[PDB]
Amino acid sequence: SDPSSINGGIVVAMTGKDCVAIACDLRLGSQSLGVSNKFEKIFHYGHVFLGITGLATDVTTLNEMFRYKTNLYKLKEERAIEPETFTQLVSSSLYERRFGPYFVGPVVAGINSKSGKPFIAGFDLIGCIDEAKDFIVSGTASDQLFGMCESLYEPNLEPEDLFETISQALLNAADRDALSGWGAVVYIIKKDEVVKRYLKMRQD
Amino acid sequence: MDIILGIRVQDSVILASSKAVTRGISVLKDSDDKTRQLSPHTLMSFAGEAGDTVQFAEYIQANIQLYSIREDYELSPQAVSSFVRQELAKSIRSRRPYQVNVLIGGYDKKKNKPELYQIDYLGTKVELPYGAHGYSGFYTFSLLDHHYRPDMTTEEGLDLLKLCVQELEKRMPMDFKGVIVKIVDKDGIRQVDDF
Amino acid sequence: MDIILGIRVQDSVILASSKAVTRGISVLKDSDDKTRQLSPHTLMSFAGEAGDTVQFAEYIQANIQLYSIREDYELSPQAVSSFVRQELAKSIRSRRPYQVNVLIGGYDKKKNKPELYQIDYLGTKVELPYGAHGYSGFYTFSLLDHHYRPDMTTEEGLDLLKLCVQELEKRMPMDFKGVIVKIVDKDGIRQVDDF
Amino acid sequence: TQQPIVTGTSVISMKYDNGVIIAADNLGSYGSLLRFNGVERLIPVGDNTVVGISGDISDMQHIERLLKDLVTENAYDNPLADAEEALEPSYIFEYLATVMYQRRSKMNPLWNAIIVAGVQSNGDQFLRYVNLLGVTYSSPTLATGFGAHMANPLLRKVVDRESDIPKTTVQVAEEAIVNAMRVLYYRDARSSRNFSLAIIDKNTGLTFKKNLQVENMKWDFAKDIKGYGTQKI
Amino acid sequence: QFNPYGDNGGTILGIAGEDFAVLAGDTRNITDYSINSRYEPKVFDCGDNIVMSANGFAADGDALVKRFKNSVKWYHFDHNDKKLSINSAARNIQHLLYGKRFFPYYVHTIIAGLDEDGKGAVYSFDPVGSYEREQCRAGGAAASLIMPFLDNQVNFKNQYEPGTNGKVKKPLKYLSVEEVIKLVRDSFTSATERHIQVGDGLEILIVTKDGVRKEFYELKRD
Amino acid sequence: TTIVGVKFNNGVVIAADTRSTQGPIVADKNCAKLHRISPKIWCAGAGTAADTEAVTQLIGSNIELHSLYTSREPRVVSALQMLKQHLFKYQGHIGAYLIVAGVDPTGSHLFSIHAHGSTDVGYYLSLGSGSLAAMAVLESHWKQDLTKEEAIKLASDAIQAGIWNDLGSGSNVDVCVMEIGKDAEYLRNYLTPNVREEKQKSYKFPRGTTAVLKESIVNICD
Amino acid sequence: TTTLAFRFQGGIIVAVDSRATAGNWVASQTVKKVIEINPFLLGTMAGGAADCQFWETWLGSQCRLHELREKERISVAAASKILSNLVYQYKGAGLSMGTMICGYTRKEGPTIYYVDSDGTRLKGDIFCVGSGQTFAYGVLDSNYKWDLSVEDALYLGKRSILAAAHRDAYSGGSVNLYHVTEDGWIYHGNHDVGELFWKVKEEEGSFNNVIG
Amino acid sequence: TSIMAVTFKDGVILGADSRTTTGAYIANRVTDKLTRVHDKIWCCRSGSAADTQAIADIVQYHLELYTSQYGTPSTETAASVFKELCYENKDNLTAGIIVAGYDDKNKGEVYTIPLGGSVHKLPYAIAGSGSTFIYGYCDKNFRENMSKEETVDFIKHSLSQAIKWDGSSGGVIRMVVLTAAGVERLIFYPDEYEQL
Amino acid sequence: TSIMAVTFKDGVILGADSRTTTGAYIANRVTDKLTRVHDKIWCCRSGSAADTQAIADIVQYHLELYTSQYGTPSTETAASVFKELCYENKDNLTAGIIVAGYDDKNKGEVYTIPLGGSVHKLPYAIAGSGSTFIYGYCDKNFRENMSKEETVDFIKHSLSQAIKWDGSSGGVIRMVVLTAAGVERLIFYPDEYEQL
Numbered sequence A: 001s002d003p004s005s006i007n008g009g010i011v012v013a014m015t016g017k018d019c020v021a022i023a024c025d026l027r028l029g030s031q032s033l034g035v036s037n038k039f040e041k042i043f044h045y046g047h048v049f050l051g052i053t054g055l056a057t058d059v060t061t062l063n064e065m066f067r068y069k070t071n072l073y074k075l076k077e078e079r080a081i082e083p084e085t086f087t088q089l090v091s092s093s094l095y096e097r098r099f100g101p102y103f104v105g106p107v108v109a110g111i112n113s114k115s116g117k118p119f120i121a122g123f124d125l126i127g128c129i130d131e132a133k134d135f136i137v138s139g140t141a142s143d144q145l146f147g148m149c150e151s152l153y154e155p156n157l158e159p160e161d162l163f164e165t166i167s168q169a170l171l172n173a174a175d176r177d178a179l180s181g182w183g184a185v186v187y188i189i190k191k192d193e194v195v196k197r198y199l200k201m202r203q204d
Numbered sequence B, C: 001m002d003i004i005l006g007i008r009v010q011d012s013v014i015l016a017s018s019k020a021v022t023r024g025i026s027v028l029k030d031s032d033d034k035t036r037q038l039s040p041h042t043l044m045s046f047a048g049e050a051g052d053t054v055q056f057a058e059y060i061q062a063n064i065q066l067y068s069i070r071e072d073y074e075l076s077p078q079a080v081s082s083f084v085r086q087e088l089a090k091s092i093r094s095r096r097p098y099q100v101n102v103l104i105g106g107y108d109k110k111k112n113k114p115e116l117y118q119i120d121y122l123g124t125k126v127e128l129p130y131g132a133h134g135y136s137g138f139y140t141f142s143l144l145d146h147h148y149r150p151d152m153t154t155e156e157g158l159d160l161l162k163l164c165v166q167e168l169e170k171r172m173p174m175d176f177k178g179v180i181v182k183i184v185d186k187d188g189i190r191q192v193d194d195f
Numbered sequence D: 001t002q003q004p005i006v007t008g009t010s011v012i013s014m015k016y017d018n019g020v021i022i023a024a025d026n027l028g029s030y031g032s033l034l035r036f037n038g039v040e041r042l043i044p045v046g047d048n049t050v051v052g053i054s055g056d057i058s059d060m061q062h063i064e065r066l067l068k069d070l071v072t073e074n075a076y077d078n079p080l081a082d083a084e085e086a087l088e089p090s091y092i093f094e095y096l097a098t099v100m101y102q103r104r105s106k107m108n109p110l111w112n113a114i115i116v117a118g119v120q121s122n123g124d125q126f127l128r129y130v131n132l133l134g135v136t137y138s139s140p141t142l143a144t145g146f147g148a149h150m151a152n153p154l155l156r157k158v159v160d161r162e163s164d165i166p167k168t169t170v171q172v173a174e175e176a177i178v179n180a181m182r183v184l185y186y187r188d189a190r191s192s193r194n195f196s197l198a199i200i201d202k203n204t205g206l207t208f209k210k211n212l213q214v215e216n217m218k219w220d221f222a223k224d225i226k227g228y229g230t231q232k233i
Numbered sequence E: 001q002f003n004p005y006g007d008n009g010g011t012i013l014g015i016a017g018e019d020f021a022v023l024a025g026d027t028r029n030i031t032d033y034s035i036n037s038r039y040e041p042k043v044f045d046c047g048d049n050i051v052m053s054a055n056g057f058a059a060d061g062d063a064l065v066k067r068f069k070n071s072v073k074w075y076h077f078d079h080n081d082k083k084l085s086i087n088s089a090a091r092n093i094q095h096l097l098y099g100k101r102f103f104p105y106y107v108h109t110i111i112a113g114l115d116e117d118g119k120g121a122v123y124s125f126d127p128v129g130s131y132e133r134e135q136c137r138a139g140g141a142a143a144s145l146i147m148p149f150l151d152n153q154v155n156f157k158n159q160y161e162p163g164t165n166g167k168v169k170k171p172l173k174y175l176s177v178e179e180v181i182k183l184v185r186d187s188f189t190s191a192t193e194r195h196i197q198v199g200d201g202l203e204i205l206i207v208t209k210d211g212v213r214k215e216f217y218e219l220k221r222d
Numbered sequence F: 001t002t003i004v005g006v007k008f009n010n011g012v013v014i015a016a017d018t019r020s021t022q023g024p025i026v027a028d029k030n031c032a033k034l035h036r037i038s039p040k041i042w043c044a045g046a047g048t049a050a051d052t053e054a055v056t057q058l059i060g061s062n063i064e065l066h067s068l069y070t071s072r073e074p075r076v077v078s079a080l081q082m083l084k085q086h087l088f089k090y091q092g093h094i095g096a097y098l099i100v101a102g103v104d105p106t107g108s109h110l111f112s113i114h115a116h117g118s119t120d121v122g123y124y125l126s127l128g129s130g131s132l133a134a135m136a137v138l139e140s141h142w143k144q145d146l147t148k149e150e151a152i153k154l155a156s157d158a159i160q161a162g163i164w165n166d167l168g169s170g171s172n173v174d175v176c177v178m179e180i181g182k183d184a185e186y187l188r189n190y191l192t193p194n195v196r197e198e199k200q201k202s203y204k205f206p207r208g209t210t211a212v213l214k215e216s217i218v219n220i221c222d
Numbered sequence G: 001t002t003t004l005a006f007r008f009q010g011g012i013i014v015a016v017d018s019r020a021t022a023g024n025w026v027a028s029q030t031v032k033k034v035i036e037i038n039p040f041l042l043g044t045m046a047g048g049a050a051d052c053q054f055w056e057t058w059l060g061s062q063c064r065l066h067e068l069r070e071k072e073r074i075s076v077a078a079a080s081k082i083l084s085n086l087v088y089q090y091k092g093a094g095l096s097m098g099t100m101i102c103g104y105t106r107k108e109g110p111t112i113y114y115v116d117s118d119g120t121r122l123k124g125d126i127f128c129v130g131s132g133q134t135f136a137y138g139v140l141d142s143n144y145k146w147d148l149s150v151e152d153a154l155y156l157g158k159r160s161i162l163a164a165a166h167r168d169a170y171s172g173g174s175v176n177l178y179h180v181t182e183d184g185w186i187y188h189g190n191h192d193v194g195e196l197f198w199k200v201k202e203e204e205g206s207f208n209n210v211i212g
Numbered sequence H, I: 001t002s003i004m005a006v007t008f009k010d011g012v013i014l015g016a017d018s019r020t021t022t023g024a025y026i027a028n029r030v031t032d033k034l035t036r037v038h039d040k041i042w043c044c045r046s047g048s049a050a051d052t053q054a055i056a057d058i059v060q061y062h063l064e065l066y067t068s069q070y071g072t073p074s075t076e077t078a079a080s081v082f083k084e085l086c087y088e089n090k091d092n093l094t095a096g097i098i099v100a101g102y103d104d105k106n107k108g109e110v111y112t113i114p115l116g117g118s119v120h121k122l123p124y125a126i127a128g129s130g131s132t133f134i135y136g137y138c139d140k141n142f143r144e145n146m147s148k149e150e151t152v153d154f155i156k157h158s159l160s161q162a163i164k165w166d167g168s169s170g171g172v173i174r175m176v177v178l179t180a181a182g183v184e185r186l187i188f189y190p191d192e193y194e195q196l
């Protein structure tokens, strides 16, 4: 009955020193029944990364829609969309469905290719932008992630340290949530290399 | 409706679907085939709300058959499953949604791989080694978690299925009147007749 | 619970009662005996609300066994069925009623007649040639209206019963896991083991 | 299970260096009808305690009778009734808190919020709150109803933590209380202009002021306000 | 209709060391969007080296603590001044809670002290008297923020030995009272950042064989 | 939220806290509640977060187009009329509660708008969960003829009352000053009275602490 | 929760997980769900945590009083019936319990009774109970034979709970194992799923749904 | 809210309190409930503030367009435009409006438009929550053809009492005088009216 | 129902209309709402007719037993007995009672007991559905220590207006005068009071 907690899942993003990280769990369930162990919640359009938690059909639908819109953007503008701009596109798109919304918690992460700035933002289901220096959290274990991030985090971590910090925030938050976990994926993003790592985690 | 299962082995996808059709306290039919061939190498099983199930299945069938004729070509299992997902994702926000869950089993002739997609009425799609809709999944997923291997033969797949149907006939409260089993592989779609 | 039937033929009463015990989507047991012997020539089958059924059955059993010892004598089937009716008629106006329906099959040794009483949870009693509680009756009454004869043998009664169980296994939506059959006659109560 | 009929609005209070102040207006509302105008909602108990009550007035009157029967009962076979065995503010509070929680636990509450203000026998200030749920708490300032929302923020600017209490005089505290009462009269639709105020000091004892009035009100700026947006005349 | 329950916010936390235990709680007390008090203690010395907190609906919490304190007093009267061990306290508290199974105390209860071998003990309860002994527990409003941090930093969950290819776990080990107080203070400032019902003050009760000590720290007042 | 507006001698000032909530959780510790409608018309918004932001952008866009069309500086009453008529149309379903202020060729102005589309005029206003704490201060200290400095003090004091006393408000004070004949000055994080204390411990992990199953380089190029 | 118990050639296996939930909040990963009533009697716990703990430790007290009064250990039948008659009294009040009373007496042999808060009491050879019962059933039923060796029976029990811990969101933590014989119950350890899942995946080659 | 309009020798006076509440909270203590829809046609508003503002704004627009085309509208015409809006949209509006204006032919007129959108021309009218408390008083003390000073006193005494008993009324008493002379705004503060 | 009691120089007068309704139907147009619970202690009843009769009957019984044992009860005592019944049974009663009596020591007294069972001693009191319409009027016109003829006029004018505006009030105006002289019943018919 609550569309935001039928399927389960989480996304978290963090800034570091000239880098950003975005991670997500792999679970897709139908209430108590775990169904898929490979359901990834992070996508990318050029160098801009989007994580989406919530109702899985809307996660899929929004990915296909933002791929659609960013493809046309690139054809008309003749350049990849930047994270600041993409964040605005996400907001307008969500708010356009104000009274019949997508039941999602999206998260944008990327480095602006002109300025080199790391950039993260989160949104509510209706498009309200939450821009943050440090971290953004989303999904069924968001209380847990807020607790982990708010204590584990410190500014200016090097890529290999940020990896450890974000991974521990995600893993320990997920283990306190029945509807999150079943695998995880972490993206470490620097100005021009992106490393994607699958974490080992408890499978219950 | 009620029981539909799918297993993807080495070189085929197998769909098993119960034969019972029930209204109130009467089993009206015990040989119902809860399936439509969408194209020569793609099969779709379905369960859910009475009337909705067949209407949706046949509507998809008509669209895929129309595409086939227009392009003189067969859409890949992945392409068909995305088309189906989108129809259900539209439907869930309509005045009256289709209350239908589906499994799509197809053999992709370009990749030479069997493929199994599980899609619910919300348009929630997932590709899986094995799948189930309804209460079935509460027994068969853990059973298959244990007995399933990625490299099994069509024949090992059928035995794995017999295990599933045995458990369901033991623990499920309803009499679903056995299953019709269909195999999808490089040579198309065929029905096993004594199961 | 769910299926309990009774047939009274020439010289015996036959009770058939399903073996399934179900909670949610799990058949917890498939050999449940939904019956208690009240006295050497009186048997009671029961169906209804979980817990209530057995608690009521055993409570009646304890009372009849107590009466037997006190008077060194066996109450007639009619007397027992009236006692049972009264307990249910009290119960229906209690703070929490017993939600239990029963069939009482007994052989009255003074009359040399078999007797079958059908009593619902309201304390509604009726003596019948054949009876059923639950959805069963919607198939078996008309079937027995057709095939039943007053002068049948115990063996003809068992065949008549096989007909009932066949229809129920064909048309009933649930898997009730077969029946345990018991015969009540001038020599007491015995169980048929291969049915 | 109950609904309040005739009600009293806020009760506000604070500690200062030598004592406690507590105030409450003199109105008994009947929904939106300002029905009764001379209602005393501060009830003194001995010479060391004032009990201030908001919420249902029929229940307030019941609580008065409980308190006045408590005094009577405490005097019985007690030769030190006006000395070492006089009722402390803390005794009176615990009794009321006990009653409130029992009544909520029987699903038949006394529909009130109560503040007990006084000075203990050792000179310590007493200020504690209890309500219809039997919830209790203490703080350098305490208020009920709208008072919690509008008075507490003002009174906290004067006493914001325990260490501000020795630094606060009875003149400062009373001024802050009297100002808070004016604000509540501006902003609470079930308040009245008239109120009572009581000071319980470890040196001067209990002073109880009746028939106070909200004074020094700014209304003049109203003459310049025209329409609701575009209207000029 | 009359609602017999409210929610007074706050959060609590208990950690056990080898020869001590802490029980911490913020000192804020709230209803709805209002602060009732910035300093209202909800962690108590109950005698016999047992500390107790019952966090949630304060009226229920106070009633429970009072009943348990009184239970300790009568245990002495009835059993020749014998010391009530922490395991015995916990079982007694289960019966206090379960006696109101059909009209619950709306609290999450934690007690701390030392077991009968002198080792630190933390016991925690659900509202109707389910209980378990652990190294570690947070309760109340911010429990969902603090608990997973405690799993990671007190019991080394998800932490492996570097270079072992995630095959050898970080080995369990007791923490000093100094390390524990650091985790408590960080837990509460983190919780104060993200939960509106947590703030103002932190009061920690430490239990050793020499008795009960208190420490107090300021928390953000917004 | 807490938000305010205060008129002075030669203009108007608005201010707001910077907390955003989802249930009892702080979603954003430093959001921006002050919105530019035009260069000298600014809006403070409480209520449904995205609604305040969307309605303020839509009307700001239309005001810009109107300003271009008419070759005039936009007026506060135009923003007010467009906002009220838009909100009225939606029967309160767009949950925006707004304080609108600015200077235009007509003078200096201060209004409030409720979600159902009703408007007020005043010299001092407050809206949001913290509006009663703020209005307590405003009613206590406001006078006719305030200087710019006095108004900024009054306004940020009013917001502070909300920050400390309302659980729905916290973090920082933002201000905007609109004076006749000058550029509007937006003072982002004018006050920052809620800076996190230093943490007790660094939780930076030994590299290799986290067990990994696979790695790969992601292709973000062409 | 997931719990199970089954009879076989070698006696009785009893296995349980160790998760406690408050909705979707994981309340605990280390909770005991078997109560050792006496050296020949075990009780399993599923449903309301307090209901299970409270009434099953109460059951133990009643069993202890039986042996003081009768100078003989209580039958599995009689012990299970004390609990079912108790919960029947509370029927409608909202108790939530799914329990198995597992033990050995000489007059009965190894015996399992299912008892729940509806008042249902059933003797039987195999039961799984709790939110994960179906998952355990699927594995347990499809490998069960009367003749399992003690070693295989123990594994199946462990493997069944692991299956449920993996697929059921409201089961997990660790497996607790018991074997009951004519000489009483024997504990066979705590097995954290954190390690057990990966170990079973490697050695058995199952769980191919999971990213390896 | 307490509002009234009273015809007299030279024209008509409108009066109102200045309180608007959200529940028991006073959202605005200096509200202006007397609103101009034409030079010498005003109304007092009660009910939903959003509804009555929306209505008054639409009426002001209609009468400004009427004026452009046909000259000064009659007070009856203004009341008819209010009614049309209130009656046709009765399901979605909570508006109780008193219309008052001064023609030179017609002198002072008062029309009251209660909740259902019916219209009633009257010598005087009272409305708003506070009005219930002064039906007795106003009926006893009103006379036709009073003077300006008598009428101001009647209104001041009436609204004084409405304010005294009604928690939803309060603040200042505002009045608008409509005569051949023009338009005059009066205000009266608590310290004056409270002790009448 | 419209009811009131007014203290004055020589004692106290009670007054009431005579209408009782079931919905919009007038079940009794000549009701007597002024009821004696002692020689010179009377009450006026409003709310549920069954409840207020049941209460008054119990009070009359209590005061007759008080009298037997302890002599004439004070008006305060009578009001306390009403309160005890109204407060303790507040969930099950819909009673709004005004108590009025004459001691020789205490002169005239009036206590009002509204719905929740609180007690309020007052110079005068009004209650019943019709009372809302005369708060303004009564507050303006009441003075302490009026004469018998002044007080009768006050009540007659007050209840006249309550009756005029309230559909649930009507019929005749009954009054009971309580002084050292004894007890006097007055009645006033529509044709007199309607055109005041």
Ligand SMILES: COc1ccc(C[C@H](NC(=O)[C@H](C)NC(=O)CN2CCOCC2)C(=O)N[C@@H](CC2CCCCC2)C(=O)[C@H](C)CO)cc1
Residues within 6 Å of the ligand: A124, A125, A126, A128, F001, F002, F019, F020, F021, F022, F023, F027, F031, F032, F033, F045, F046, F047, F048, F049, F050, F052, F053, F095, F128, F129, F168, F169
């Ligand atoms: C009707 O439901 C509501 C209404 C208002 C709030 C408070 C508001 N928070 C939000 O809007 C958050 C980001 N989003 C949600 O709570 C998601 N909602 C789901 C259902 O519909 C509404 C959207 C919020 O934080 N408001 C702030 C001011 C915002 C801050 C962000 C910048 C824009 C203005 C303020 O009013 C104080 C904190 C309380 O409202 C929550 C739920």
Ligand SMILES: COc1ccc(C[C@H](NC(=O)[C@H](C)NC(=O)CN2CCOCC2)C(=O)N[C@@H](CC2CCCCC2)C(=O)[C@H](C)CO)cc1
Residues within 6 Å of the ligand: E104, E126, E127, E128, E130, G001, G002, G019, G020, G021, G022, G027, G031, G032, G033, G045, G046, G047, G048, G049, G050, G052, G053, G094, G095, G096, G130, G131, G170, G171
């Ligand atoms: C009647 O309502 C119910 C029923 C069942 C549950 C699940 C149960 N959890 C709890 O009991 C939790 C800790 N506490 C509560 O839910 C709090 N009370 C519930 C009863 O009403 C008052 C509030 C739980 O975790 N059950 C476990 C088995 C327990 C674990 C603890 C030891 C005893 C056995 C299990 O059934 C799986 C996890 C499914 O819950 C919750 C509420």
Ligand SMILES: [Mg+2]
Residues within 6 Å of the ligand: A174, A175, A176, A177, A178, A179, A180, A181, A182, A204
């Ligand atoms: Mg998890």
Ligand SMILES: [Mg+2]
Residues within 6 Å of the ligand: A203, A204, G164, G165, G166, G167, G168, G169, G170, G171, G172
């Ligand atoms: Mg699990």
Ligand SMILES: [Mg+2]
Residues within 6 Å of the ligand: E191, E192, E193, E194, E195, E196, E197, E198, E199, E222
């Ligand atoms: Mg906080």
Ligand SMILES: [Mg+2]
Residues within 6 Å of the ligand: F091, H092, H093
């Ligand atoms: Mg409306």
Ligand SMILES: [Mg+2]
Residues within 6 Å of the ligand: H163, H164, H165, H166, H167, H168, H169, H170
């Ligand atoms: Mg007023």
